[PDB]
Every structure is written in structure tokens, then in C-alpha cells.
């Protein structure tokens, strides 16, 4: 009955008896973790036991239930430290992630690696498997070294071992190997740690940020489909005006990624078929457990998931991504529209945006936006009632306060968009 944080020193927040909505909780969480108002949209709530995400509009009526506050919408090579991968950036009037969000992503990466939510890739061969295990030890060294740098302690100061900083499956794999192999691994680890902390760390003056980035990039390369969600289905439909391809008799996978959009494939006993990138979707309809995604070319993808909740999770992912790369003020399905965005466009309120865009929007025309620093006020301060900074009259809603007191352009560019 609480929202959990992967950060080291962040107590969870217990929920009392009452009605809640996922978005408000995500705001509280974003506030708790010093997350900027721009990056708040990247985060969502994950239901640990059912393995199902919550859409922003999902109502929680309160039993034991533990929800993880985590970054859901991810873009490979956001760090731009990859030459074989396309760069990711944000429109200027520049990087995707700030430090605050990056820290949380790092914590998240550690938790995922250890608890195997981010499982290691399968070995193409025995040596490759060994090499994967080696890289795991490397990751352990990275984690421990980061912890060392943060606490301003050195190697003689720290007591610990590699065992709680690797995937549990590998650890348990190791504990069943003979003594000599366990000894060997532990020694080799200790050597890696020693060398890294004696020479490399200061020879190149490796910062903490650098280690985080390294860790996460290694996560991208070392684990299965990192920063991606895969959905199973036994009934898949890909159709157009003159085509109607139905796949049936869970045998089919549909993957959603932030830099390739929606893809699908026959679940293996090779490569993914691209359906659509996000900007091409016009709308998404849900009927029961069935999701129907409509593209601009009148093409359609339709799939039947396990239930309604999973459909909500799926579309909420797709929708969030659409907001991330297409239009920051439009939504694709009413079933998962965040009340804020609805009330936003309903009252003609933009999103927090860089000023140049505001002044430009004002010049080529009163523009209403959101505070680029905090969630508490609209650039007018809203509370649990709407009013101005110096005002005393609590107008029950924005519309009322505005009545007694321009608009956002569809598919308009901004720093709220990721160029991929």
C-alpha cells in the first residue's frame, strides 16, 4: 500500500484510506526525488506482483500493495556515447536527461540488473557466456566504485563483495559451482576492483557521472531489450485498404521502443517487423482486452492481450511515447488520458516550455504554460483551488478563476520533444 523508490536514502510513502490517481502520485514522487517538471512525464508506476503498469488516469481506491515509481519511457543511446547508434537529443530554441533523473535511472538500473528485471543476454557461445559473466563482474566493480566515490571513502575504508551487485541468477549459479571456482571469481573480482580503483579511476579522473553513463550504456549492450516493453499475443492483425493479415494459433510478440516505435514478430522457437513509429498513429481504440492501433496511411495493427488492464498499460505506454515524440498536448486514447493534459488543453494550457518558445508564441500571436521549476504553479499558483500569487480567492477551478479573471499548436516543436 505504498510507492517505492530505488534511490538509496528515500523512504517510501504510505497511503491512507482514500481515492488516488496515478498522476498525482507520480507528481508526489517526482517532487520527492527532485525530478524536474519536464522529466516527470518519463516516469510511471509499476505494479510489482501483477507486472502491469498504471495509466496516468487509473484510480486507486484503498490491504497490501506495493508500487514501484520508475522511469518507463526510455531512449537508447540517450548518453550519446555510442558510435554505432543514432544520437538522441532535445530541440533548442539539449540533452534528454538531467543529473537528478540520471541518478534515479542509475539506481533503477542497479535494481533491475540485480533483481533480474533486466536479464543478461543469452550466450552466442560458451566463451561469450563467460565474457558476459566477466562484464557482470565489471558492472559490480562499477557500482561499488560509484558507491565509493559518492561516500568519499577509499578502498581501505570500505569493508562488501560482488555478490549483492550482480544478477541473483548468476550469484545462485556461482554458489553451486565448486569452491575453487568461487575463490577464483572472488579473487578476479577483487583484482578488477583494485586495479580500477588504484589506476583507472584517477589516471583518467573518471567522474561519477561518467560511471553512471558507463553502467547504463553497458546495461543497454549487456541485457535483453533494455528500455523496451514486449507484449505477448495469440491473435495479431496487420491490415490496410487492400490487405488483411491475421496471425493466430501466445505465439506473437509486439515490442514498443522509444526510437523505433512499435514492432512485432513471431515468437521464436527472426527479426522484428516495423509497424509504425509514433508520429504516424492517429488514434488507438480499446475494446475489452483488444487494442486497435490506427496509422495515418489507414493501416491498422490490432491485438488481443490478456485483459483490460494490460491493454491500458500498453496504450498508456504508446500514448506517453506519442507525447514524447509527436505532439506534447494530444492524446491517442481517452481510456488513458491523464486528467492534467485534458484539463490542460480544455483550458488552453501548454506545457512547461523554454521561454524563447513562449516569447515567440506571444510575438507571432496571453500564453498559459507550466512552471519550468516546480509543479505547484502555472506560468498563478494552484493548490489542493486556483488563485494568483497574491490572490486570496480560491476559485474552485482554473476555468472559474479565468472566467472572473492563444493556445498550443498541434505537433508543435519544443524541448518537450525528443529528436531521436
Amino acid at each position: 500500500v505504498e510507492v517505492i523508490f530505488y534511490l538509496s536514502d528515500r523512504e517510501p510513502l504510505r497511503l491512507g484510506s482514500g481515492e488516488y490517481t496515478a498522476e498525482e502520485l507520480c507528481i508526489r514522487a517526482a517532487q520527492a526525488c527532485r525530478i524536474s517538471p519536464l522529466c516527470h512525464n518519463l516516469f510511471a508506476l509499476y505494479d510489482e506482483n501483477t507486472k502491469l503498469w498504471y495509466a496516468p488516469n487509473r484510480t486507486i481506491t484503498v490491504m497490501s500493495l506495493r508500487l514501484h515509481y520508475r522511469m518507463r519511457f526510455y531512449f537508447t543511446n540517450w548518453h550519446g556515447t555510442n558510435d554505432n547508434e543514432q544520437s538522441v537529443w532535445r530541440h533548442s530554441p539539449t540533452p534528454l536527461l538531467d543529473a537528478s533523473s540520471l541518478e534515479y535511472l542509475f539506481a533503477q538500473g542497479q535494481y533491475d540488473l540485480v533483481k533480474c528485471l533486466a536479464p543478461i543476454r543469452d550466450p552466442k557461445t560458451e566463451q561469450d557466456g563467460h565474457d558476459i559473466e566477466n562484464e557482470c563482474l565489471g558492472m559490480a566493480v562499477l557500482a561499488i566504485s560509484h558507491y565509493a566515490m559518492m561516500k568519499k571513502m577509499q578502498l581501505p575504508e570500505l569493508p562488501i563483495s560482488y555478490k549483492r551487485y550482480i544478477p541473483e541468477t548468476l550469484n545462485k549459479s556461482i554458489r553451486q559451482r565448486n569452491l575453487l571456482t568461487r575463490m577464483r571469481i572472488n579473487n578476479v573480482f577483487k583484482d578488477f576492483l583494485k586495479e580500477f580503483n588504484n589506476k583507472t579511476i584517477c589516471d583518467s579522473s573518471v567522474s561519477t557521472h561518467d560511471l553512471k553513463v558507463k553502467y547504463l550504456a553497458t546495461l543497454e549492450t549487456l541485457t535483453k531489450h533494455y528500455g523496451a516493453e514486449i507484449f505477448e499475443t495469440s491473435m495479431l492483425l496487420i491490415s490496410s485498404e487492400n490487405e488483411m493479415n491475421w496471425f493466430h494459433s501466445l505465439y506473437y510478440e509486439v515490442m514498443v521502443t522509444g526510437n523505433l516505435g512499435i514492432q512485432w514478430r513471431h515468437k521464436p522457437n527472426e527479426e522484428w517487423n516495423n509497424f509504425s513509429f509514433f508520429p504516424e498513429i492517429t488514434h488507438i481504440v480499446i475494446k475489452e482486452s483488444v487494442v486497435s492501433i490506427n496509422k495515418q496511411d489507414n493501416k491498422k495493427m490490432e491485438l488481443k492481450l490478456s485483459s483490460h488492464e494490460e491493454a491500458l498499460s500498453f496504450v498508456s505506454l504508446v500514448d506517453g511515447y506519442f507525447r514524447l515524440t509527436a505532439d506534447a498536448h494530444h492524446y491517442l486514447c481517452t481510456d488513458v488520458a491523464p486528467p492534467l493534459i485534458v484539463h490542460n488543453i480544455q483550458n488552453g494550457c501548454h506545457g512547461p516550455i523554454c521561454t524563447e518558445y513562449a516569447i515567440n508564441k506571444l510575438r507571432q500571436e496571453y500564453v498559459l504554460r507550466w512552471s519550468c521549476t516546480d509543479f505547484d504553479n502555472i506560468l498563478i499558483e494552484v493548490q489542493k483551488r486556483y488563485s494568483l500569487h497574491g490572490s486570496d480567492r480560491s476559485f474552485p477551478s482554473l476555468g472559474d478563476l479565468m472566467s472572473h479573471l492563444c493556445q498550443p499548436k498541434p505537433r508543435e516543436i519544443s524541448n518537450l520533444l525528443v529528436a531521436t
Binding site: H130, L142, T181, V188, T200, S204, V206, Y215, L222
Partner: peptide, 21 residues
């Protein structure tokens, strides 16, 4: 079976995860 006969008793190589500029 042998105690030492497995990939871990190859010559230890620094993992690429710890490579820096």
C-alpha cells in the same frame, strides 16, 4: 570432472565495462 577445467581459469582479462578514455 575437474575443478580447474572451465573458462574462469583462462587468463583474466579486464572487462570492457571498465574501459575509459
Amino acid at each position: 570432472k575437474t575443478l580447474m577445467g572451465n573458462p574462469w581459469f583462462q587468463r583474466a582479462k579486464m572487462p570492457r565495462a571498465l574501459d575509459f578514455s
